[PDB]
Design a protein around this ligand. Structure first.
Ligand SMILES: Nc1nc2c(ncn2[C@@H]2O[C@H](COP(=O)(O)OP(=O)(O)OP(=O)(O)O)[C@@H](O)[C@H]2O)c(=O)[nH]1
Ligand SMILES: Nc1nc2c(ncn2[C@@H]2O[C@H](COP(=O)(O)OP(=O)(O)O)[C@@H](O)[C@H]2O)c(=O)[nH]1
Ligand SMILES: [Mg+2]
Lengths: 277, 431, 40, 371, 426, 50
């Protein structure tokens, strides 16, 4: 009736020792053929979390080709009961099943919001022209530009994209229009920046966008603004992130809600790692 | 998703529900505030849009003396304001006050709260009623609540957690009248009735648990541990899960017999489990000993009918089957001849959790044994003898007759339990 | 040492059983497992 | 005469914190123990040789019969009056300008008698550095001072002695280097100082200030303090043993390492548990003659862990340490650390990693996982 | 929530109520000014039971004070705790009762009850849910036995459902302080047995016996005798106002103690008593409370329980305590003293538990006891009443004011039937 | 998670075997070197045969 464990020469011990030896053999042959799960997912997180530098604006104007970050501001929201606080940032996010299984990044990758202020490999965006070969030119209100993210990979460039909703392709939680990342070049990658004030929108159309200011991002093929939801959370391998959709929110005065506001955050001149905020 | 409604009635019900919902909160990691620091909780904790969980229990009492302690103590923010129902005047240890005059005015509010809580239950398993025989509220109000619940809700399961009078000591004088008059009523409108007392838990906590000076909290924590081990199959995952319907079906052969006995193993302190080996054989031969049952009656006098074992923790079915075979080989346990297969088994993975400042040690495996026996007729015969020896001289009868009932209810309540005694010997006769 | 009280005027008494038991249950000497830090 | 201390032990077999009363009679060096919650005797009046009166202070882990006891408070007013009024506490801070000069400072401290309880090498970032500089908000030279703090690594030490504040201020002397040189001769600042801004040392002046500095550097609440300066590349591990620390040759070990030319990028103080000692020495289990004696010498007292950055100036650090046996070292390689600071084979006062391939795991067990 | 309306009449009832309203002013931490000076928060949760809220945070008692003579109001209003009682709650006449039951029940108490009934009915409807009534008077006097038992009939015909409780000062043979006192004691017993649910008979000789051997007082004045009585009323309603483990209000006690409607005569006891030099040595423990509680010299009535048989026994515990020691101590005294209890009612003992002990103390227990041996007390009155009635002594103070002699011939008949009623169940 | 714990435990076991196997050879080689260096001066390591 007595049991002693894995050291004592009592009862049936030899068969247990043979189980340990065959498990060692199976581990060794899996090591030799390289099917171990510990060897797979090292490089992807390293390239996603490697630090990056940001651009410095001489005149405070958003220029083409500069390295910027997308930051949603902090604003107290009455309509939400449980919601995140502080300034959010837009970051790429693969699915956790894909992160476990495939070492290579897959298309499309989701978008989310993380409370992070330092630039990392997940959230450094380059503002690019739609007809290309344009560098050092002022980005103006009501124009076309693309937000290319390398993701820590020099080989591939990915564009923010969002198409018209169907009965099969929608967001995970809100079931609204959703935004993803695909490498294909089309018109669904072009985004448009506008002034928040509706009365001064048409007057400020065509002026250079200043850095670190509140602007709205609108897709040209939809005119649904990029928005971040705080009362619905996405649980991923990186933790708890906020949902990002493409929808226009208007109050009773028909002005845009603080969900739609965004800043193109640039870097500090003294320290490249620290941002302007 | 599967969920049950807890109804605690009386001072015993409230002071058991305190130490029971404490264990539920600690098992699911629910703070006394009401928020989980971070779906198995949905069996007892209903969600809210703010991430706040509220229980599916109803506390009822005709005096606010203990409900105000609930509303004032550590768990004030957790329970609903309307899930704790109070009256102004107590039943004063009277079945007539509990059933006809004082217990008739708040039954509408209690039924409304039961209906409101049952409407949000997507799939309801049944009701568990925690009460005491020896109290006026816990007899009369529970009887009328059982009647109205059986009229309204048709075929839901009804399980009883009933505090029965101890054979030697008790806390009242008119508890034979109360016990007779409520056991006459609750026979037809109940499905199963787990029975406990106080002297058996006193003896257990003295001999096994090594404190010479116990308390109602020490009793109530063991009762809550037993209830949690009963509902652990619905709450968590295991090899073989039991249900309320399953051990309602698997424990009672006849509609007039719904009286098991509850036993729990192991009960031990933190000092002694450090040294004693806790094996499946020892925790299953702990239950079958007469010194470890929580009803002061000896099963060597009677014959078993059915048994249901619930195992939790690092347990293996091979050793479970070997221990059950050893139990079947051992002779001093007798069984009725018409039940050749007497055992039910349920398996759960999670080992039991202990409370800070607690008394039981942190164990790896545990077992709860619910066994139908014929050796409750002995205690019922003693209570019937006490009832006759009181009723011969017409003592304490004017209190009952001046508040609503007539005098024939006593005669009917004795005659029906005499018939149930006759049915006990008829079932116990070998074929 | 007419008496004005039937004792020696102690005051440790102002607490209740249920509240005091639940208070010790909420706050006591915290025991948690301290897992040994492995090499790998 | 007896001294009573309540002690806490974590029971690994059941995971409970258990409080006992440990009673020490210093006339014969005898220990007795009783149980608090059970009110019964736990251990007879037994003459235990390893435990001394110098090891009895709050925050110390003493190994009584293979149990680690952490003394939490004074037992009664008698031991409070006898010990707490005498033993006092202060904080020693070594500035980045004298990191290479730290060995002489520690050695002069050990002559002065200040018992080191916790030692750490750390780098302050801007937030905790500004929290450090709160009293200096009058801005004499605030930006230069905060830059001087944030450039290099600092050393934080806890030192116990009677009249600790007064004696440490006497050793430090005036803050200005030239003023200290004129006023005194043997001051630490005067001996190893450059100017007023770089005084090479610091210390609190009042009890509340010392408590605030304690809560700033070493959080007793449970929060993580400032990190170390472990680089985790091209380095090996070294251990200064409890007997060497208690004897007071730590400063001589640091000076000998500096004279050899090896660079110590990080170092700190541990008071390790026997489970960690066995997990560390399971590789030596069964391959050396004396395993249990090395384990006991490792967990008997406080350990000092160092990351030695191999500059390959002369040879390997193992070759500098020399043979394991002190007599073999004294007869073959008389210039080695074990030949200088070793008395028997069990206690050699310096431990060095034997396998060159294990340097990364050796540093990462101490300064990454145990950090 | 459950408000207790205290009543007192006569000279003795006024002086007991002056001491009773002192100890629960101490227990609830109420100063003689009228405000609250306490430290805990358990004192204020149930304070409307005994005290009425007013403006400025002033609490006043829900008590009335009645006597036909204004002599005893002056000592009450000028006592240590005299400023708390409301001035409108003193009802006084100008002519004293003078140890005659007829003056208190037919002539001088005839018009005084109309002013009291205005005061009582105002405080009766002020309660949200009235628990019942409580009274303290003297049988050997004129006002307490005269008007007090006249009010008992008049309150009972108004609110029949509410419980009535009585704390009586029954006479004494050797400590007799009145000549004509068997008349006033006999004629009030008839007015008690019909309109009362609980009667606590307190006698004057047993209190002098307790303070001599147990508290060892040299000069046991009335302030010492009233205080042991004053501790009893606090210990019986202790669960109506404080949290506990097993509550027992006034209706809970009457259900267990009273099997038959005429068996409502108790005899009380208070468990923890010891002198100042014996306080620091005797360890106050639950076995020590149990042993002292059942003693014959411990009781507050002039009856020996060894000559009778207990019908039902109640015990209300106070303080922090376990219950296993309580359950086996009540069981051990029931097993060993099997001849001291009746055999037709099993489980003669009722137990109740509270949390808060009395102030200055750590554990306490109040004994309420229904015993057959109360008829020994009533036989001494009845044998004295016949010796006076056979010679028609002192009757011209009674039949000369408007009273028939039939009330004398009938009150001996009811008292004779009750003492023969206890004797059957012995 | 548990699979990763199992694989890490097996890897630690194999690392312990490899480290012991190397440390044996290192200790024996250094013992031989010390024996030769002692015999150079004229003293020898002590081993008893009684
Ligand atoms: N095991 C256990 N039994 C209890 C507890 N509290 C009360 N009881 C039982 O309850 C009985 C007394 O009845 P109560 O529950 O206090 O009162 P009640 O049932 O509401 O009846 P009334 O007071 O007339 O309204 C005692 O005899 C105890 O056996 C408890 O906390 N644990
Ligand atoms: N124990 C006690 N007895 C008292 C007190 N005051 C009066 N008595 C007794 O009451 C008896 C006299 O009662 P009496 O004043 O005539 O009653 P009344 O006429 O109704 O006011 C005396 O025999 C006293 O012993 C008191 O404060 N305590
Ligand atoms: Mg009740």
């Amino acid at each position: 009736q007595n049991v002693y464990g894995p050291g004592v020469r009592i009862g049936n011990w030899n068969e247990d020792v043979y189980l340990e030896e065959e498990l060692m053999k199976d581990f060794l042959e899996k090591r030799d053929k390289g099917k171990l799960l510990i060897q797979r997912s090292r490089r992807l997180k390293q390239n996603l979390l490697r630090p990056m530098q940001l651009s410095v604006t001489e005149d405070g104007y958003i220029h083409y080709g500069d390295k910027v970050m997308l930051v949603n501001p902090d604003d107290p929201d009455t309509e939400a009961d449980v919601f995140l606080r502080g300034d959010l940032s837009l970051c790429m996010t693969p699915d956790e099943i894909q992160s476990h299984l495939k070492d290579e990044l897959e298309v499309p990758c989701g978008l989310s919001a993380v409370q992070a202020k330092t630039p990392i490999g997940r959230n450094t965006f380059i503002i690019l022209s739609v007809h290309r070969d344009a560098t050092g030119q002022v980005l103006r209100y009501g124009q076309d530009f693309c937000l290319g993210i390398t993701g820590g990979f020099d080989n591939k460039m990915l564009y923010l994209s969002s198409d018209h909703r169907t009965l099969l392709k929608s967001s995970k939680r809100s079931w609204l229009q959703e935004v993803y990342l695909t490498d294909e070049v089309s018109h669904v990658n072009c985004w448009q920046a506008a002034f928040p004030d509706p009365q001064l929108r048409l007057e400020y159309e065509g002026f250079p966008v200043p850095a670190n200011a509140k602007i709205l991002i609108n897709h040209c093929h939809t005119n649904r603004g990029l928005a971040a939801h705080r009362h619905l959370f996405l649980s991923t391998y990186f933790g708890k992130e906020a949902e990002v959709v493409a929808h226009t929110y208007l109050d009773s005065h028909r002005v845009e809600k603080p969900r739609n506001h965004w800043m193109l955050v640039t870097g500090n001149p003294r320290d490249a790692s620290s941002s302007m905020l | 998703m599967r969920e049950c409604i807890s109804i605690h009635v009386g001072q015993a019900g409230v002071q058991i529900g305190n130490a029971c919902w404490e264990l539920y909160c600690l098992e699911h990691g629910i703070q006394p505030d009401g928020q989980m620091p971070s779906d198995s909780f949905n069996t007892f904790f209903s969600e809210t849009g703010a991430g706040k969980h509220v229980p599916r229990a109803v506390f009822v009492d005709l005096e606010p003396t203990v409900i105000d302690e609930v509303r004032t103590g550590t768990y004030r923010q957790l329970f609903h304001p309307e899930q704790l129902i109070t009256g102004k005047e107590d039943a004063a240890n009277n079945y007539a006050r509990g059933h006809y005059t004082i217990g008739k005015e708040i039954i509408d509010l209690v039924l409304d709260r039961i209906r409101k809580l049952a409407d949000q239950c997507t799939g309801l398993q049944g009701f568990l009623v925690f009460h005491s025989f020896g109290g006026g509220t816990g007899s009369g109000f529970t009887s009328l609540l059982m009647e109205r619940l059986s009229v309204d809700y048709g075929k839901k399961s009804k399980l009883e957690f009933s505090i029965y009078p101890a054979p030697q000591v008790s806390t009242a004088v008119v508890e034979p009248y109360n016990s007779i008059l409520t056991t006459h009523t609750t026979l037809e409108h109940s499905d199963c009735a787990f029975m406990v007392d106080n002297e058996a838990i006193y003896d257990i906590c003295r001999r096994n648990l090594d404190i010479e000076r116990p308390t109602y909290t020490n009793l109530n924590r063991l009762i809550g541990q037993i209830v949690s081990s009963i509902t652990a199959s619905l709450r968590f995952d295991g090899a073989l899960n039991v249900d309320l319907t399953e051990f309602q079906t698997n424990l009672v052969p006849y509609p007039r017999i719904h009286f098991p006995l509850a036993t729990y193993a192991p009960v031990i302190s933190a000092e002694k489990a450090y040294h004693e080996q806790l094996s499946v054989a020892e925790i299953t031969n702990a239950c079958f000993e007469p010194a470890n049952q929580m009803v002061k009656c000896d099963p060597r006098h009677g014959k078993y009918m059915a048994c249901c074992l619930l195992y939790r923790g690092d347990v293996v079915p091979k050793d479970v089957n070997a221990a059950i075979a050893t139990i079947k080989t051992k002779r001093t346990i007798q069984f009725v001849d018409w039940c050749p297969t007497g055992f039910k088994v349920g398996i759960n993975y999670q080992p039991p959790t202990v409370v800070p400042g607690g008394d039981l040690a942190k164990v790896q495996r545990a077992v709860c044994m619910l066994s139908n026996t014929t050796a409750i007729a002995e205690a019922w015969a003693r209570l019937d003898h006490k009832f006759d020896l009181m009723y011969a001289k017409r003592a304490f009868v004017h209190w009952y007759v001046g508040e609503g009932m007539e005098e024939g209810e006593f005669s009917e309540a004795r005659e029906d339990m005499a018939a149930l005694e006759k049915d006990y010997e008829e079932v116990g006769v070998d074929s | 040492p007419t008496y004005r009280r039937l004792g020696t005027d102690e005051s440790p008494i102002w607490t209740s059983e249920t509240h005091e038991k639940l208070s010790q249950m909420c706050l006591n000497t915290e025991w948690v497992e301290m897992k040994s830090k492995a090499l790998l | 005469e007896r001294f009573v201390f309540i002690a806490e032990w974590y029971d690994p077999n059941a995971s409970l914190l258990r409080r006992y009363e440990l009673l020490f009679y210093p006339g014969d060096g005898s220990v007795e123990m009783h149980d608090v919650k059970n009110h019964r005797t736990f251990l007879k009046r037994t003459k235990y040789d390893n435990l001394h009166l110098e090891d009895l202070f709050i925050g110390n882990k003493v190994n009584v019969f293979s149990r680690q006891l952490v003394l939490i408070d004074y037992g009664d007013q008698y031991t409070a009056r006898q010990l707490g009024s005498r033993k006092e506490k202060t904080l020693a801070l070594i500035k980045p300008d004298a990191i290479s000069k730290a060995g002489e400072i520690i050695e002069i401290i050990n002559k002065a008698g200040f018992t080191i309880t916790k030692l750490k090498m750390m780098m302050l970032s801007r937030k905790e550095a500004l929290d450090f500089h709160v009293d200096h908000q009058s801005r004499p030279f605030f930006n230069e001072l905060i830059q001087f703090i944030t450039t290099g690594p600092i050393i934080a030490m806890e030192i116990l002695r009677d009249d600790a504040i007064c004696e440490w201020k006497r050793l430090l002397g005036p803050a200005n280097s030239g003023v200290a040189r004129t006023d005194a001769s043997e001051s630490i600042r005067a001996l190893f100082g450059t100017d007023g801004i770089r005084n090479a040392a610091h210390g609190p002046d009042s009890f509340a200030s010392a408590a605030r500095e304690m809560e700033l550097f070493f959080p007793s609440s449970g929060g993580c303090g400032p990190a170390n300066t472990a680089k985790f590349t091209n380095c090996t591990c070294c251990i200064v043993k409890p007997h060497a620390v208690s004897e007071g040759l730590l400063g001589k070990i640091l000076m000998a390492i500096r004279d050899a030319g090896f660079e110590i990028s990080a170092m700190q103080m541990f008071n390790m548990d026997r489970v960690n000692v066995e997990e560390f020495y399971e590789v030596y289990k069964g391959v050396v003659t004396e395993y249990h004696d090395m384990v006991t010498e490792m967990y008997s007292g406080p350990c000092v862990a160092m990351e030695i950055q191999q500059n390959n100036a002369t040879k390997t650090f193992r070759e500098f340490c020399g043979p394991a046996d002190p007599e073999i070292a004294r007869h073959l390689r008389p210039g080695t650390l074990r030949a200088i600071f070793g008395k028997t084979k069990i206690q050699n006062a310096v431990h060095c990693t034997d396998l060159p391939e294990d340097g990364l795991l050796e540093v990462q067990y101490f300064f990454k996982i145990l950090d | 929530m459950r408000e207790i309306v205290h009543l007192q009449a006569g000279q003795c009832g006024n002086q007991i109520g002056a001491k009773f309203w002192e100890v629960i002013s101490d227990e609830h931490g109420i100063d003689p000014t009228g405000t609250y000076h306490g430290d805990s928060d358990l004192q204020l949760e149930r304070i409307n039971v005994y005290y009425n809220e007013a403006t400025g945070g002033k609490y006043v008692p829900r008590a009335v004070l009645v006597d036909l003579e204004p002599g005893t109001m002056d000592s009450v209003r000028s006592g240590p705790f005299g400023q708390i009682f409301r001035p409108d709650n003193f009802v006084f006449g100008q002519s004293g009762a003078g140890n005659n039951w007829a003056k208190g029940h037919y002539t001088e108490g005839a018009e005084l009850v109309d002013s009291v009934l205005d005061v009582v009915r105002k405080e009766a409807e002020s309660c949200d849910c009235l628990q019942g009534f409580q009274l303290t008077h003297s049988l050997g006097g004129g006002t307490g036995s005269g008007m007090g038992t006249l009010l008992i009939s008049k309150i009972r015909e108004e609110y029949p459902d509410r419980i009535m409780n009585t704390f009586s000062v029954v006479p004494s043979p050797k400590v007799s302080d009145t000549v004509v006192e068997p008349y006033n004691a006999t004629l009030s017993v008839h007015q008690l047995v019909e309109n009362t649910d609980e009667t606590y008979c307190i006698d004057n000789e047993a209190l002098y016996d307790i303070c001599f051997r147990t508290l060892k007082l040299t000069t046991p004045t009335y302030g010492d005798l009233n205080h042991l009585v004053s501790a009893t009323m606090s210990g019986v309603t202790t669960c109506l106002r404080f949290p506990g483990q097993l509550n027992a209000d006034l209706r809970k006690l009457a259900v267990n103690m009273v099997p038959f409607p005429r068996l409502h005569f108790f005899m009380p006891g208070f468990a923890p008593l010891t002198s100042r030099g014996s306080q620091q040595y005797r360890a106050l423990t639950v076995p020590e409370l149990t042993q002292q509680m059942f003693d014959a010299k411990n009781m507050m009535a002039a009856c020996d329980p060894r000559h009778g048989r207990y019908l039902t026994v109640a015990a209300v515990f106070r303080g922090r305590m376990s219950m296993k020691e309580v359950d086996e101590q009540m069981l051990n005294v029931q097993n060993k003293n099997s001849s001291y209890f009746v055999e037709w009612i099993p489980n003669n003992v009722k137990t109740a538990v509270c949390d808060i002990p009395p102030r200055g103390l750590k554990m306490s227990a109040t004994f309420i006891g229904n015993s057959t041996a109360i008829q020994e007390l009533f036989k001494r009155i009845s044998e004295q009443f016949t010796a006076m009635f056979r010679r028609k002594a002192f009757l011209h103070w009674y039949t000369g004011e408007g009273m028939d002699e039939m009330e004398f011939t009938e009150a001996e008949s009811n008292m004779n039937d009750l003492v023969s009623e206890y004797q059957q169940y012995q | 998670q548990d699979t990763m714990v199992q694989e890490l435990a097996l890897a630690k076991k194999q690392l312990l075997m490899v480290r012991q196997a190397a440390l044996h050879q290192l200790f024996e080689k250094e013992h031989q070197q010390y024996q030769q260096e002692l015999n150079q001066m004229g003293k020898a390591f002590y081993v008893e045969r009684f």
